[PDB]
């Protein structure tokens, strides 16, 4: 679990561009405003290399 990757983002990434920000993702209409709970999934998850 020491490798991270982004699954949620607003738009598609531009060719040759690195995304280092970690702003929370909004999958609905609720104004989460940085709570990171239900309907506010974290944009960075981990892999599982067994």
């Amino acid at each position: 679990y020491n490798y991270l990757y982004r699954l949620f983002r607003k738009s598609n990434l531009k060719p040759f561009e690195r995304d280092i920000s970690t702003e929370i993702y909004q999958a609905g209409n609720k104004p989460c405003n940085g709570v990171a709970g239900f309907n506010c999934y974290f944009p960075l998850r981990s892999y599982s290399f067994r």
Partner: nanobody
Amino acid sequence: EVQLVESGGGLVQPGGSLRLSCAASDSSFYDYEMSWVRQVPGKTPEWIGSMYPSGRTYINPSLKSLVTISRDNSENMLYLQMNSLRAEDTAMYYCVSNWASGSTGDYWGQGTLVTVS
């Protein structure tokens, strides 16, 4: 210039809460990543937790609901509080700045032992 000094390492019985802290140098080490990593002898390094500049701290899914990373001091400090210590927690702990993008720019600072017996 980078002389991150770790403190808190000692002998804690199984069940206690160990509070580690890596004091950084007086510079602009903020606005960047900050990560913890254990160094159990005889195995590859294992990621513990991150300290992303926005404030959102991501924890290893394996060590979930067991450790936490706090930075509510804003001056120079970073704190790692680990609760419910187990037997496999005897390892060398390190607090690095440039993780997840290193191998040519990662600065591994100092490291202390943590034994749980």
